[PDB]
Amino acid sequence: MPLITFISPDGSRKTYEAYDGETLLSLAHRNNVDLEGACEGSLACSTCHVIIDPSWYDIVEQHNEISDEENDMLDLAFGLTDTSRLGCQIILTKELDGLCVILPTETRNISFVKNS
Predict the structure, then answer these.
(1) Which InterPro entries does the entry mention (predicted)?
(2) Are 68 and 48 in contact (CB under 8 A)?
C-alpha cells in the first residue's frame, strides 16, 4: 500500500496512500469524504493493468509497439482515459509507488486535512 502524488490543474498536489488496482473510491471512504458511487470495487487485485500520468503515456506508447491485436484493444476501449493503458475503469496501482501522476477523476483540493 504505497503512496501516490496526485497533481492538480491549479498547481496544487494531494497526498493519499493508494492501493493495487484500487480506484480513488477506496480513498474517498478512508477520507470519509463526500463520495458518489457506492462501489466497494475489489479487495484482491493482481496482475492488473497500468495507469500513469498523461505525460508518460506518450512515452510508454512510443516506447512500446502495438500489434494487430494490441492496437485493436484501443478500438474496444470506451470511456477510458488517455492516461490509462490496457485499463477499464482507471484504477491506480502500487506500480506508481514513489511516482507522481495525475488522478483519474476530475477532483481537486489543496486544504490540508488529517482524515481518520
Answers:
(1) 2Fe-2S_ferredoxin-like_sf, 2Fe-2S_ferredoxin-type, Adrenodoxin-like, Adrenodoxin_Fe-S_BS, Beta-grasp_dom_sf
(2) no
